[PDB]
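Chapter review: from sequence to fold.
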Amino acid sequence: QNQNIPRGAVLHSEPLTVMVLTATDPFEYESPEHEVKNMLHATVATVSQYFHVKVFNINLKEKFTKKNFIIISNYFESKGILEINETSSVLEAAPDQMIEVPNSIIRNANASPKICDIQKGTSGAVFYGVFTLHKKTVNRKNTIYEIKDGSGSIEVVGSGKWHNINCKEGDKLHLFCFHLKTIDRQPKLVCGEHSFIKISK
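The token string follows.
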């Protein structure tokens, strides 16, 4: 711990134009020092790639609206996820900087992984996606959300803000930035600091 770039992460200084595809509202979370912090999640695309983005400056909420074009620089990339820090630059693109993102990229960005492919993951691998709730178990300390698709079932462990969420079997759980851990010799998805869940009917 001597530079702020995480282990195995990369600093990108050069400007990158992206189109915003989706974004969450700002939400509060807790830092390891128990400070209340604020961020949002977003998905953005270039003409050739999409990225999930952790946005650590909620003053950027209006810039991260669907179909807006923005230019990012001085941001980190870690495990394929972009991180927009308070020190990052995020500017509104000019008309001559807008780009044409193919629909295939947008469909891809919006696709969820199958649970069987999540189950193949290495310890610590990070996943996002929308899954059907099969079974919920609220414990003293955390909640087990068992999600299922045609490829398999897996447990999602929620604690803190993600403990005892208001949902029922059959609802869809939109998971942001969960990661794989081995518990009872079986892959489970668990929260990290920046995890988020949204429920839909």
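Two observations follow directly from the output. The first helix runs from residue 103 to 110. The first strand starts at residue 9 and ends at 12.
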